[PDB]
């Protein structure tokens, strides 16, 4: 009948993606490490990469990556996929705040828009194209 007005704010209402890393490392320790690493490497951003709970592909043992601010999401996909156990026929998707980012985005763009108050950017991955 009538139009439905979609609002960007809806994206922000979803609950945060799971992060064992956040839960098991006290906030102040994370924030101190993130601030220090940002000062040390002004051309890089610190990223935490974790499996979405519903993902059906292999887990990732190493979570902490320091990435060039100009690396693109497509390049990051290549590098991270190399480290996960999945079939060539398995898919791989990344999520930042529950949303799949563009292949063309840079890690510095994602970091500026989405880093948390500990100065880390959190990315989840799944073989499914929805976070859960």
Residue numbers in the entry: 6 to 137
From the paper:
Landmark proteins called autophagy receptors bind specific targets and interact with Atg8-family proteins on the isolation membrane through the Atg8-family-interacting motif (AIM) (also called the LC3-interacting region, LIR). The core of the AIM is composed of four amino-acid residues [W/F/Y]-X-X-[L/I/V]28. The first aromatic residue and the fourth aliphatic residue bind to two hydrophobic pockets in Atg8 (the W- and L-sites, respectively), and the main chain of the motif forms an intermolecular parallel β-sheet with a β-strand (β2) of Atg828. Nonetheless, deletion of the short helix from RTN3245–264 reduced the interactions with mAtg8s. Thus, the C-terminal helix-assisted AIM/LIR is a unique structural basis commonly seen in the interactions of yeast Atg40 and these mammalian ER-phagy receptors with Atg8-family proteins.
We also determined the crystal structures of GABARAP (a mammalian Atg8 homologue) bound to AIM (LIR)-containing sequences from the mammalian ER-phagy receptors FAM134B, SEC62, and RTN3 (FAM134B450–468, SEC62361–376, and RTN3245–264). Remarkably, all the AIM-containing regions of the three ER-phagy receptors are structurally similar to that of Atg40, consisting of the core AIM and its C-terminal short helix. The first and fourth AIM residues of FAM134B (F455 and L458) bound to the W- and L-sites in GABARAP. In addition, as with Atg40, the second AIM residues (E456 of FAM134B, E364 of SEC62, and E249 of RTN3) and acidic residues in the short helices (E462 of FAM134B and E370 of SEC62) interacted with R67 of GABARAP. In ITC analyses, FAM134B444–470 and SEC62355–376 bound to GABARAP-subfamily proteins (GABARAP, GAPARAP-L1, and GABARAPL2) with Kd ranging from 0.11 to 0.30 μM and from 0.19 to 0.57 μM, and to LC3-subfamily proteins (another subfamily of mAtg8s, LC3A, LC3B, and LC3C) with Kd ranging from 0.21 to 1.11 μM and from 0.92 to 5.18 μM, respectively, suggesting that these AIMs interact with mAtg8s with low specificity. These interactions were significantly weakened by mutations at E456 and E462 in FAM134B444–470 and E364 and E370 in SEC62355–376, as well as at the core AIM residues in these peptides, or deletion of the C-terminal helices (Δhelix). In addition, the interactions were also impaired by alanine substitution for R67 in GABARAP and R70 in LC3B. The mammalian ER-phagy receptors FAM134B, SEC62, and RTN3 interacted with Atg8-family proteins in a similar manner.
